[PDB]
């Protein structure tokens, strides 16, 4: 069980750790988060009490290094940093735990929610979408645009999601225009799965990462990517049975976790209605269809 110590908390902030969140008061004796489950990526996220604008945060995996948070009064945010001195780090953490100045990652033993939201998400894939190669963790915020949003402006600060565009030469073979537009199997299976992602695990990892950035940061470009990757599968007549069954599980947990009060901004009516009621896969997503009809019958 790993620890992300905080140097201090000089500004009042709501702190997120995965699907959990805690309020910290200005200059509260808060020195971090302990008992973080090993084996998963994690995200530690912030919303300042005095400017709720810019949710921001850090994707990390405690297996890759010793990370801590320290407020920067110049740049006005909580920054993740790596401690290269193992013994300094172990000594800091032991002291803060002894003084009980840390919140415990509040996992219920029965509760697979975080695993179910991050099953295919790998830190090495996150670091290719979010390019800052000198850190082992990845910064994301509410405002960051996607490579696709930028084509339609600072390249270093972009989310490099895989570009999906249904009306593009990549998506449509010369001479198979109607076939490829109405049945996206070519685009899904040959271009995306065999060509770019190499396997369904990497495709699902990106889909899951996009959803979590949409949900945790209200990142609009991430929401667009999440829906495009759903629509590409649902709009394909030929999808391996294992991928459909896995997608149903993936979407079920995403819909389960979504705050009820953000459904209006985080869910695209057209995509979900098309995916559940008109697409080739309209009858393939039993679990997802059932939770959507019971939780969000207004959207449909």
């Amino acid at each position: 069980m790993n620890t992300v110590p905080f140097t201090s908390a000089p500004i009042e902030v709501t702190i997120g750790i995965d699907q959990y969140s805690f309020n910290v008061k200005e200059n509260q004796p808060f020195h971090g988060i302990k008992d973080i489950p090993i084996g998963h990526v994690h995200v530690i996220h912030f919303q300042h009490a005095d400017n709720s604008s810019m949710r921001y945060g850090y994707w990390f995996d405690c297996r890759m290094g010793n990370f801590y948070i320290q407020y920067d009064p110049k740049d006005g945010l909580y920054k993740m940093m790596e401690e290269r001195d193992g013994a300094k780090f172990e000594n800091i953490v032991h002291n803060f735990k002894e003084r009980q100045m840390m919140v415990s990652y509040p996992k219920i033993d029965e509760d697979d929610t975080w695993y179910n939201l991050t099953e295919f998400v790998q830190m090495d894939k996150i670091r290719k979408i979010v390019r800052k190669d000198e850190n082992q963790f990845s910064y994301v915020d509410s405002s960051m645009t996607t490579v696709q949003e930028n084509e339609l402006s600072d390249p270093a600060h972009s989310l490099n999601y895989t570009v999906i565009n249904f009306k593009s030469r990549e998506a449509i073979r010369p001479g198979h225009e109607m076939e490829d537009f109405l049945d996206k199997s070519y685009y899904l299976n040959t271009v995306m799965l065999q060509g770019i992602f190499k396997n369904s695990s990497n495709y699902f990892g990106e889909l899951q990462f996009a959803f979590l950035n949409a949900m945790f940061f209200g990142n609009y470009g991430s929401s667009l990517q999440w829906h495009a990757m759903i629509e590409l599968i649902c709009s394909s007549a030929t999808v391996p049975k294992h991928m459909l069954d896995k997608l149903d599980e993936i979407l079920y947990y995403q819909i389960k976790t979504l705050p009820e009060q953000y459904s209006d901004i985080l869910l695209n009516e057209r995509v979900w209605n098309i995916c559940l009621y008109s697409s080739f896969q309209k009858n393939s997503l039993h679990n997802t269809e059932k939770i959507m009809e019971n939780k969000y019958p207004e959207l449909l």
């Binding site: 009306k167 593009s168 030469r169 449509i172 225009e177 109607m178 537009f181």
Partner: peptide, 8 residues
């Protein structure tokens, strides 16, 4: 859409 796709 048919014409856009044929004229990519």
């Amino acid at each position: 859409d048919p014409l856009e796709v044929h004229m990519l």
